[PDB]
Amino acid sequence: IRTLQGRVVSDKMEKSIVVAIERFVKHPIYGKFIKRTTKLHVHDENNECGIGDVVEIRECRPLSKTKSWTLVRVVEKA
Amino acid sequence: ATVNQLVRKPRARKVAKSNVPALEACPQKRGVCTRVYTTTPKKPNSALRKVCRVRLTNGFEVTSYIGGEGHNLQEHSVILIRGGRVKDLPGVRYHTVRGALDCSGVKDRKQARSKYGVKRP
Amino acid sequence: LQEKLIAVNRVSKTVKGGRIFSFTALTVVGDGNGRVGFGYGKAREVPAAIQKAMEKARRNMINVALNNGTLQHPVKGVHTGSRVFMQPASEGTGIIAGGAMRAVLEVAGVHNVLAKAYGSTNPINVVRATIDGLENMNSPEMVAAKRGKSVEEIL
Amino acid sequence: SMQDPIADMLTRIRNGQAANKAAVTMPSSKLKVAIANVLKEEGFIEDFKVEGDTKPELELTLKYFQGKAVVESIQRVSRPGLRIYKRKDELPKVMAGLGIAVVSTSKGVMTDRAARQAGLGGEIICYVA
Amino acid sequence: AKEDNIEMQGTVLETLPNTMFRVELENGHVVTAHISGKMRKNYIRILTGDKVTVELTPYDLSKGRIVFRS
Amino acid sequence: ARYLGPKLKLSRREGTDLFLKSGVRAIDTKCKIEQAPGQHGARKPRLSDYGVQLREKQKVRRIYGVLERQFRNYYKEAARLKGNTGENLLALLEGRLDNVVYRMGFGATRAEARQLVSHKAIMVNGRVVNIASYQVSPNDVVSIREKAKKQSRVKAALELAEQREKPTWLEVDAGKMEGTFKRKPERSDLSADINEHLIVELYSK
RNA sequence: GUAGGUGGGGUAACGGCUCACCUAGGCGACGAUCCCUAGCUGGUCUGAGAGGAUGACCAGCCACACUGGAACUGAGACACGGUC
RNA sequence: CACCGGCUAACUCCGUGCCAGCAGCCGCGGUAAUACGGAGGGUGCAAGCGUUAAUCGGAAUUACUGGGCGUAAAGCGCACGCAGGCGGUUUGUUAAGUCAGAUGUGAAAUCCCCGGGCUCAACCUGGGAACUGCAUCUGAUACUGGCAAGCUUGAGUCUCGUAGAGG
RNA sequence: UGACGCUCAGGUGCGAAAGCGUGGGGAGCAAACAGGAUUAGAUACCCUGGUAGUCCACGCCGUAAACGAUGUCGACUUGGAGGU
Numbered sequence A: 001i002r003t004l005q006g007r008v009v010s011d012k013m014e015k016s017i018v019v020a021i022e023r024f025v026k027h028p029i030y031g032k033f034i035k036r037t038t039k040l041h042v043h044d045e046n047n048e049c050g051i052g053d054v055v056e057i058r059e060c061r062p063l064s065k066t067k068s069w070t071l072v073r074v075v076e077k078a
Numbered sequence B: 001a002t003v004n005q006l007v008r009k010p011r012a013r014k015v016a017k018s019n020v021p022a023l024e025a026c027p028q029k030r031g032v033c034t035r036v037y038t039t040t041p042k043k044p045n046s047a048l049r050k051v052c053r054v055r056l057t058n059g060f061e062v063t064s065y066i067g068g069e070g071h072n073l074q075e076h077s078v079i080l081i082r083g084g085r086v087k088d089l090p091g092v093r094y095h096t097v098r099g100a101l102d103c104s105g106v107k108d109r110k111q112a113r114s115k116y117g118v119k120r121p
Numbered sequence C: 001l002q003e004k005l006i007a008v009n010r011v012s013k014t015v016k017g018g019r020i021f022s023f024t025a026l027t028v029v030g031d032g033n034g035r036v037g038f039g040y041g042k043a044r045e046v047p048a049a050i051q052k053a054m055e056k057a058r059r060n061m062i063n064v065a066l067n068n069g070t071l072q073h074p075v076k077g078v079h080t081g082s083r084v085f086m087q088p089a090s091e092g093t094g095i096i097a098g099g100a101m102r103a104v105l106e107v108a109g110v111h112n113v114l115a116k117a118y119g120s121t122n123p124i125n126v127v128r129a130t131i132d133g134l135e136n137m138n139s140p141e142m143v144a145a146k147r148g149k150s151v152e153e154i155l
Numbered sequence D: 001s002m003q004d005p006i007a008d009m010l011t012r013i014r015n016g017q018a019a020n021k022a023a024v025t026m027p028s029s030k031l032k033v034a035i036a037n038v039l040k041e042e043g044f045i046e047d048f049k050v051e052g053d054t055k056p057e058l059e060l061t062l063k064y065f066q067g068k069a070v071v072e073s074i075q076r077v078s079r080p081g082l083r084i085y086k087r088k089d090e091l092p093k094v095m096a097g098l099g100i101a102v103v104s105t106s107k108g109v110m111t112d113r114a115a116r117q118a119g120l121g122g123e124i125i126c127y128v129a
Numbered sequence E: 001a002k003e004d005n006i007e008m009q010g011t012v013l014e015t016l017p018n019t020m021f022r023v024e025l026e027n028g029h030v031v032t033a034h035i036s037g038k039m040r041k042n043y044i045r046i047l048t049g050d051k052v053t054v055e056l057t058p059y060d061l062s063k064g065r066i067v068f069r070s
Numbered sequence F: 001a002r003y004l005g006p007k008l009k010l011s012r013r014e015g016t017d018l019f020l021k022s023g024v025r026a027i028d029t030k031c032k033i034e035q036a037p038g039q040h041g042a043r044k045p046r047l048s049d050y051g052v053q054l055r056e057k058q059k060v061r062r063i064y065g066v067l068e069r070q071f072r073n074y075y076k077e078a079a080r081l082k083g084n085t086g087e088n089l090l091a092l093l094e095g096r097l098d099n100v101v102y103r104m105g106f107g108a109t110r111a112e113a114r115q116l117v118s119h120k121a122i123m124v125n126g127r128v129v130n131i132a133s134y135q136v137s138p139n140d141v142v143s144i145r146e147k148a149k150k151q152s153r154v155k156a157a158l159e160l161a162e163q164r165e166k167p168t169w170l171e172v173d174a175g176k177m178e179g180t181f182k183r184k185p186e187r188s189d190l191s192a193d194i195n196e197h198l199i200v201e202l203y204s205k
Numbered sequence G: 001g002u003a004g005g006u007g008g009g010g011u012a013a014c015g016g017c018u019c020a021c022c023u024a025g026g027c028g029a030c031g032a033u034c035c036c037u038a039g040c041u042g043g044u045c046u047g048a049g050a051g052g053a054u055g056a057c058c059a060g061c062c063a064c065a066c067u068g069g070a071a072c073u074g075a076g077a078c079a080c081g082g083u084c
Numbered sequence H: 001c002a003c004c005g006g007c008u009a010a011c012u013c014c015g016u017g018c019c020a021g022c023a024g025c026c027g028c029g030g031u032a033a034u035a036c037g038g039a040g041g042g043u044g045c046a047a048g049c050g051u052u053a054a055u056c057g058g059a060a061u062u063a064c065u066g067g068g069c070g071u072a073a074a075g076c077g078c079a080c081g082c083a084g085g086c087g088g089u090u091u092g093u094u095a096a097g098u099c100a101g102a103u104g105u106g107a108a109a110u111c112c113c114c115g116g117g118c119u120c121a122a123c124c125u126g127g128g129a130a131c132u133g134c135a136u137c138u139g140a141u142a143c144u145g146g147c148a149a150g151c152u153u154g155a156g157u158c159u160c161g162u163a164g165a166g167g
Numbered sequence I: 001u002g003a004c005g006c007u008c009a010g011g012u013g014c015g016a017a018a019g020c021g022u023g024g025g026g027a028g029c030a031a032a033c034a035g036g037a038u039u040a041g042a043u044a045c046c047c048u049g050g051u052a053g054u055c056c057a058c059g060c061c062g063u064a065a066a067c068g069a070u071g072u073c074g075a076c077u078u079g080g081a082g083g084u
């Protein structure tokens, strides 16, 4: 149900992708809306995602040291 | 400064130092007099002003003003110093507390006695 | 009219003999009901300097639209290096102003105001900035007039 | 380059009023026309018109009252380098509600008063007084 | 009511900047003396070799005030 | 913790009758009210704006008999309370039991009233209160205790209060020796000589 | 073991937690790494506010128990007044 | 208990004579010192009063609110240019930013408001308000962003010609 | 043609004169220096000479009151007299 949408920035790991989730946040002091990036290691069972793809992801149990997110679907192919 | 420049590098507040570093944020410090002497003040004024070089417990060697008329301090006197610049003496950032430890009160004082460590007659 | 001495300054011009000293006098006057003016007098003696200032102040009185002993809205005044800010206050606040601004606001008949003086606080330039503030203030009725509306439509 | 057409429009009104111009003209846009409509109905300008087709041009007829310009001040608030948005409860009163703030809400560009009564916040385009 | 000084004669052995002087006293001790205010105000010049009265203090016997020049 | 020194010196410094004597005799007959106290008192120097503010504050303090810390607290309360701080401040001072006892006419001065209170001679709603700063509220009945009804100073103090302007916000009964604090005094009910806005400004520094 | 994978082992439990093998990744100017300082918070002080400073008392959380290791017992400890 | 030259409420006499000393800053003291020391008088606080330390304020003196850069401190010697910031105009679409409503949460204490209890107060306490936040759901779609298709006014290309101590 | 734009930390290049390296060149000029004066002194200004250098090639240096002591780009806002 609860998902993040972001862009694939690596696919060099077996069954794993790095996904960048871009956020647009008001700066606390100065009030300018800044772009902030959360990078997440995500599980990609079938190795379907390539770099540039837009992917929907969901939070799951730990799968490795760094992985606690899994691929839902590819929204847009690159 | 533009908003975007402040985002990249915020307003740095100036790190204002103490005027009384040898106290180390204590209201007084004890010390031992290493020398007790007189010094001539800066141009407009003239006097022989009573001072002492004091080795503090925390190991800072500082100069302290000995206020009031007349004092009993010698080398190896143990004194309490407070904060207090004397404008017309370079480097004198501390006053000796009168009527504390080895430093006597001022003789025959009747006004501002509490500033010079003198009991009520 | 109410009258108030703000500052008296001894000024000096060098001549071949030595120095000719003379006195300046910043004063303000007002009715305590919207009208206020400032004057600046020069003389060789202080009492003459004051009287000159008072006479100039009496003839250079502006009008101000006050809302029952306070301002209509926040106002910013500037003159030279003096930048002043004033805003309306509720009854019983009193005049929360500094030095020169208070004198102006007192005699003008502003009982309740919150004020601050930024930049230079030279009395001469502060008084001008203050009165510059009060003259550029707008009532509801005159805002309604220029905009071609009623007071109800504006407010 | 030109990066704020709205600031430009406001500057044209401000400069035009300072130079006692009868009217000011500029390249039109839907948003400019929207702001122009607020200015007109609040009575800070007399009228406006759009002329052209491929390259439309907005003309504004400036008001004067007893010689003096009606637009005392006109300030760009939200700008490209720093966008400003406000919730309905924190909509700014300009000149203790003698001026207007022009607010882009989800129900179109309007005054802060109308945004409050509608019960909407939005982007604070400009102050006018 | 003030504490008392020790007057003593001496010869100015050298002049120093800003009306400061080395003065060898009667007892043979060299003090760094300074000019009095009254002598400064009245423009009494002091030179190397001049015989001077020096007011000393018991608080410091390396310092003095030149109050008279003979 | 109280001022125990000479009274008329205070009146002289303010340049007004602070009512610190009973008022059987005129203040000019007991002292030189026009002249400030001391050697250099015949001089009348020009007083600064700060000095005007201070002397207004000290006037009100000296009337009621309140030291600075307690007065500053009364100011903080007035600032907090809704409405006019200046009017609130004077209401609080008028609330005080020592004042109320005086205004009813049981003490000849506020100092004599303060002693009555302090010496457990006053009851608020039938209960002994010996705190001078006790805030009396509307519809409270201040009274003299049966032991203190015989006190000759209380008989005399009533006769003095008959001379003075009677408070409209109180209602005393001389035979009973009790009175009802009907309401809080309005700003109109108190004297116009007090420029309370000067105190408001003084503390706004 | 660094990042991921596969398989075995391990844990109350997911997991490089561990191991073997395979792949060559992973993090970093949106400040990694390194150095210095520091228990965190509710709050507290100051300030018109926005801020700034602070984290004593009280209450929540964490860490430590002469110093460095280690486990045992137990529902729970790697245990202030337990063990080696 | 401190203070009484100004800031800063409060002034005289005597002693001293740039000495002794005072002092936060400006300053005071060299013979008639309201500034030193004492005294009389006064002012401010008061079971405290001063002094020191420390923080914020005043300081718009790091300026988001809320500052500057010709000469006061401050435009890189000049350009090109990657990252980054910013983006003319129209339609559709999306709904990230944004806005609205709702739900959950935001410990108690503390702060604030209206009450209550200790003779009053401090203090204790009932209820409320507040906790400006975070998440989710449902909506809104002007503006900003994404996506798609355009448009020609920004920016380029081509044609012809001109001046020039440009290299 | 159809927003392809503006700005730009880091980066890259250009950057007077002096200076540096290597090899040429060297009329005039001229730091240093030599002599002649002046003067209280004259390590100067003045006079007569004079080396580096000034010139060329290639490489280096990266600074100047490198100034409009005024960053770049865009829009808007009365006039007058000139130059090209």
Ligand SMILES: NC(=O)OC[C@@H](O)C[C@H](NC(=O)[C@H]1NCCC[C@H]1O)C(=O)N[C@@H](Cc1c[nH]cn1)C(=O)N[C@H](C(=O)O)[C@H](O)c1c[nH]c(Cl)n1
Pocket (backbone or CB within 6 Å): I038, I039, I045, I046
């Ligand atoms: N030497 C010493 O220690 O002190 C003496 C000095 O003060 C002399 C004085 N000098 C000057 O002004 C210099 N001006 C610059 C050029 C050289 C020189 O001339 C002077 O008066 N000169 C005279 C000539 C002279 C030199 N020695 C004796 N007489 C002179 O004619 N000076 C001219 C002037 O003062 O306007 C001018 O400077 C000048 C022209 N031609 C020459 Cl040479 N000098």
Ligand SMILES: [K+]
Pocket (backbone or CB within 6 Å): B044, B045, B046, H018
């Ligand atoms: K002096």
Ligand SMILES: [K+]
Pocket (backbone or CB within 6 Å): F078, F079, F080, F081, F082, F083, F084, F085, F088
């Ligand atoms: K109030």
Ligand SMILES: [K+]
Pocket (backbone or CB within 6 Å): G001, G016
């Ligand atoms: K590992």
Ligand SMILES: [K+]
Pocket (backbone or CB within 6 Å): none
């Ligand atoms: K594994």
Ligand SMILES: [K+]
Pocket (backbone or CB within 6 Å): none
């Ligand atoms: K905090």
Ligand SMILES: [K+]
Pocket (backbone or CB within 6 Å): none
């Ligand atoms: K340990």
Ligand SMILES: [K+]
Pocket (backbone or CB within 6 Å): G074
């Ligand atoms: K057990």
Ligand SMILES: [K+]
Pocket (backbone or CB within 6 Å): H063, H066
């Ligand atoms: K700013």
Ligand SMILES: [K+]
Pocket (backbone or CB within 6 Å): none
């Ligand atoms: K949109």
Ligand SMILES: [K+]
Pocket (backbone or CB within 6 Å): H082, I008
């Ligand atoms: K770029």
Ligand SMILES: [K+]
Pocket (backbone or CB within 6 Å): I051
């Ligand atoms: K040569």
Ligand SMILES: [Mg+2]
Pocket (backbone or CB within 6 Å): A065
């Ligand atoms: Mg983890």
Ligand SMILES: [Mg+2]
Pocket (backbone or CB within 6 Å): F001
């Ligand atoms: Mg007390």
Ligand SMILES: [Mg+2]
Pocket (backbone or CB within 6 Å): none
């Ligand atoms: Mg620590």
Ligand SMILES: [Mg+2]
Pocket (backbone or CB within 6 Å): none
């Ligand atoms: Mg502030």
